[PDB]
Amino acid sequence: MSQFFIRRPVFAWVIAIFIIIFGLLSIPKLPIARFPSVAPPQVNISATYPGATAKTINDSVVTLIERELSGVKNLLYYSATTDTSGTAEITATFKPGTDVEMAQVDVQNKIKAVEARLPQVVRQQGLQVEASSSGFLMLVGINSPNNQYSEVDLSDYLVRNVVEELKRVEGVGKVQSFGAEKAMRIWVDPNKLVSYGLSISDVNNAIRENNVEIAPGRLGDLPAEKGQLITIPLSAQGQLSSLEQFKNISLKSVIKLSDVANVEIGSQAYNFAILENGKPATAAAIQLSPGANAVKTAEGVRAKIEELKLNLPEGMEFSIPYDTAPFVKISIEKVIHTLLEAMVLVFIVMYLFLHNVRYTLIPAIVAPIALLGTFTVMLLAGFSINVLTMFGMVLAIGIIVDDAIVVVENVERIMATEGLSPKDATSKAMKEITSPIIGITLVLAAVFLPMAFASGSVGVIYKQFTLTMSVSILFSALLALILTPALCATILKPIDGHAWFDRSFDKVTKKYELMLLKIIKHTVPMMVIFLVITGITFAGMKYWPTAFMPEEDQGWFMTSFQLPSDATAERTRNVVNQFENNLKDNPDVKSNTAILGWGFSGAGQNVAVAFTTLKDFKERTSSASKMTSDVNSSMANSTEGETMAVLPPAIDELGTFSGFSLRLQDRANLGMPALLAAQDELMAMAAKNKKFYMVWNEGLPQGDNISLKIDREKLSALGVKFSDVSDIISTSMGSMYINDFPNQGRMQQVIVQVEAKSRMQLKDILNLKVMGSSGQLVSLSEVVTPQWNKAPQQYNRYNGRPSLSIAGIPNFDTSSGEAMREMEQLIAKLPKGIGYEWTGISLQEKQSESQMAFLLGLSMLVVFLVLAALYESWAIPLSVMLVVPLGIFGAIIAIMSRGLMNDVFFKIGLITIIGLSAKNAILIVEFAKMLKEEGMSLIEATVAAAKLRLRPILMTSLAFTCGVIPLVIATGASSETQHALGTGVFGGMISATILAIFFVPVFFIFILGAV
Template sequence: GALAIPQLPVAKYPVVAPPQVEVYAVYPGASAQTLDESVVSLIEQELNGTDGLLYFESQSSLGSASITATFKPGTDPEMAQVDVQNRLKTVESRLPQAVIQQGLQVEKISSGFLMLVTLTASKDSNLDEVALSDYLARNVMNEIKRVEGVGKAQLYGAERAMRIWINPQKLIGFNLTTTDVNNAIASQNAQVAAGSIGDLPGSKTQEITATVLVKGQLSSPQEFADIVLRANPDGSTVRIGDVARVEIGSQEYQYGTRLNGKSASAFSVKLAPEANALSTGNLIRAKMDELSRYFPAGVEYSIPYDTTPFVKVSITKVIYTLVEAMILVFAVMYLFLQNMRYTLIPTLVVPVALMGTFATMLVMGFSINVLTMFGMVLAIGILVDDAIVVVENVERIMVSEGLSPRDATRKAMTQISGAIIGITLVLVAVFIPMAFMPGSVGIIYQQFSVSMATSILFSAFLALSLTPALCATLLKPIAKGEHHAKGGFFGWFNRKFEHLSQGYEHWVVHLIKRSGRYLLLYGALLVVLVVLFARLPSSFLPVEDQGYIITDIQLPPGASQNRTIKVAEQIEAHNASEPGIGNTTMILGFSFSGNGQNAALAFTTLEDWSERGAKDSASAIAKHGVGPFGDG
């Protein structure tokens, strides 16, 4: 069990979302409608009938489209990805050539971002946003994708590329078309395999051999500008530089990034299914620290959005609660048993049962999350019950019959073994049905119920094996009929507890004599309980302050990026004046509602929980933002 703990994934909740596989297609220059008709519809038709497929959804924007296929819970993500790739092979021949050249990306993903990493340059640096994106694409992205636990790393930018901006009027004036430009570039910017001199078979007098190197591909804007489009009979030529402006720019301008109002470049990371969120986050940070040593002068990275601190805090709080519960259980047992040896036996049993539960969780593919840890916290009180029953029965037999600890343990186990097994089966029967609930709710309660049932089963097993062994070896013999009168604090506690017990007995007798009126009171309490339960708000999971706010920005169709930037600047200015807010990262061109110039997504990271009060909670800050922007 101890060896299983480091191998268990760590997450806030179990993986509730069903497995998803994303297909990403790029069609440079194509409109959303063209992509939908020539690419997306064909892929969607082919995905129909995929094993375990629940549904699929697609988003098309200028130049790119994504299709997300969602599978039934329990489907193996690896096999789902392979199945999707096999089906794409049958449809590739019907896709546009430009899409095939760019390639179809197929990745298994999880819903939600793990973190967002940005790259910024100081004022003294001569690197702009395009240069930062190019550096990320060439030197960072591949390293991050190889990090264990990373499901998808998406760059909100692009590599540098040779941009040829055609002037339509000049092109028409020379009686040329864009097809002529494409053909000229393809024919004059080609990698040529020129062969070699003196290769075999050769003459007997051949002394040397050499490889012929031919410069086929062009590398500078001037070389592209000199590409000949047409040679006239009079010896004159029309070149690309005559009809277009050639420069080195970005491969695409779909996305943009702003960090606290300043230009930056960024990429997001999504967790792979069943991956360890904390471990993956730590590995990414370590990798970025390693890569940052080779960054150009004036360039630095930051992680303005990170979900792992909340996961870490949540699990840490539950672990503290688990430790506190064990301490309280130990204190209560010592208070009532009033003997360190008697108390030590149940205390030793609890960690062993929990370790067995961790080992079972690893075998079943569970994770360390709030629900499994919560199940263990609840199970602690149940775990000690079986051990206490064994210890008290052994002590009773030693006092009443004067037997040795070893003989008293043997006799005690013949008396209570059946009772322990019966109690265990009843408790397991209470929790196990929750593991068979269907849908996402069943997934949430499955790990909770199974961890509880496993802990209880291990407790019963230990009560029949380890606890008797400890009783036979640790307990001291007691003379027959020996009195255990206590003085001091324990004597005072026993007298007070006896007095309290007698008072409770008198109250129960009084209650039984007037059962009618108390049954009416009980019925009234049940009615009040039902009314209050019906009025309680309901939700799939509790709404918590996770330390960040995500704002989806969607302008009217056709709105340019300039209008989107103005809205982004207003949000940035509002966040800068709002107490409790740390960083504001704006992704232009991307949102949960779709991609395009009219879309953006804001990641607002809040200050640490210790530095914020109730007035600066995530929900309060979000409500403050509804006023200025809710009607926009």
């Protein structure tokens, strides 16, 4: 009971101070991210076959792992993709909830098992098994305006002095060096080689022999002759270092390497380059750690940057062309200011409505307590301060201050119209509202929790909001039972000080009472208009575009350039430079970087990414959406290749609204051409159908490949061994490695490779003569036939079946399940041996996303049971439960007046307003029943209860509305989400208060007259 606490107020004070101490001790120890982990744990295997047709890599380095990687702990689905450049990556997504680490080790064990069947090169290159964080933490770039250091010098200095040093930093996961350390590049020349009668094996063995480390040996190594005293670790030195040293190796009369091969200090590989403001420079792509925060780690990396900025040589300069931490910090700090403004607005309206500060120090002293508690529980449950949880708190503040308001207001009303002492008045008020508050706690839980069990990323999104607000309202009501009684018993002083607002209030209350009477004279037309509102609510709810986490202006945007399938880097460089020159004329573009040769859809020589960032919102003259549209339009012309700019994704796997991702896979070994033709047929049959919106593929189009048929007959005739021809080809253009060599105190590499000027055209392959057995040497042309063909370069596997990705989003008037079954029906027409399988979000929306109706049913049942137990009557609960359409009415009317979508934020605000409306209705009908139990006529008992409940309802309503109004008028960074949550909650509040105040007593009269 609350009476006890009242008599022992210092007890409650302590119950509060303990919560306070725990919260102030718990806040600084909480991970501070923007959005929590939503994607399932994707263990990403990576393998590289340096220089092989994608079709060979798939059939040789992916089929094995495919046949073996399976049955591991809770593996949900595993996909694989082999690109042009010879890289095959396999994303295995496990069952939700599982741990990435243990399962990753499992995958490691499985991979270790198939290490033999793997070709030699793959084995020597290793099979990476990362944890797959798809978010680049930050780009640390290094440019030099003075041009004293070129692109290669810059990359060397980065990979030497900085990369290994950035990794020695708390929170860094992976540091992609988009460069390479200087390496002893040896460009051989096949013409002079053949002329000398040599071969690439000759030069390789010459290096590996004339350059080799030697095991040291320790003079006196035990056992030693009895007597020996002084030992010494005799070293040995056997790898050439200087350019000249390498340029003087006699192969087979004596012939120096400089005679047959040029030698220079190039790089390990020229895969990636980096343009920045036009200036060629280098960069390093930081990759957050799988399980760390974001803002703290990135700020620590910036500190590490400011530390390394001192020893930076002359000419160089550091830069951060992409940084996500400041936006995260601004968002969180923005939400926190919203909490503070909401609390101060509650304080203000409380002073306005209760006439003195003695009453305002009640919800201002209790609300923080509750919030503090929530923080503690968030720690003890593994949560993390983020926009989700913080929006939950700011959405819960209304309910919290509502309970506080109810208590204090009732204590005041009693203290004014009874002439009681604050202690006795509070005692009486708690006697009358001790139980309804418990019913409130139960119904709140029954509308919050049973909506926290849906599966999927969206399920986790919900879980955050739900668990945070539920723990907050539980603490709020527990406080309302423990502390507030003590507050209203001790802190409150007898009301004596009289402010011309009293007249206005009494006057409008009497007007409402008369109006109410006039309304309950027409219960049946009231019911009519109520069903009209319910229908209008259902209409807006079923005929509105549903979305997920709408877009925003994060300050930057990613422009991906995808050239044809046979283009060269230079082409890509031309496109990126044209894009850069197009963006030069804007004032909003602050920094513009471009990774020439990398791509989130796989690496290559025809793919580029440009992370263009804009200035802060303070000094902008356009929005990121307008800028991206301008970029797209300006790109669609004047250049070539699909170069499109795209806004950052709100959350992982949450960019396109309901863009179901399907995989058309084979099941009868139909072969790639048949599968491709069937997919084109399905794409046609889908473009021809309604209820769709731009069905499109995801794999690159076909590619021009070159198949070199080797005439064995001619080989055995002329006598050359097949091995010789094979080796000549594989060593004609393959970036072969040999061993290490010391230079500048580092162990750099020495790579042998045919000089680029002699391995570009196809005709050059013909100059690759080979010594024949008949005393002559034959050109490779007379034995190989180059046959062109068009084969798919992008190879894809899904659940061990050759598959093709197909993504699409449904139009208006179409739900998600309708589009799913529409696609199902469309694929069931395809020829035999062609199955389908959804994936990721699309998949979740089929397996366990028909639970929303089930969950809502569970919630409604529990709400009915709780109310029924609260009133011991099977008729009253329906009165309160009928308050849903009002709250929704407000939400929809608001969502329409601004044009937002039915996004998850709108739904959680809907839950918050539904809860508050149920609260209002509960208290109204409870006081009505109480007055009805004392012989007072229901016709006037209900009216009197409403007349009494008017002040707290308007009080709490105005408080919450004014407190969330910033979320509605917010401007600046991250204001989008603020809007998507404030418009809904604001309209909901408006309709809830203005409609419930009238309908809830009308509902009570209707129900109690119905029996």
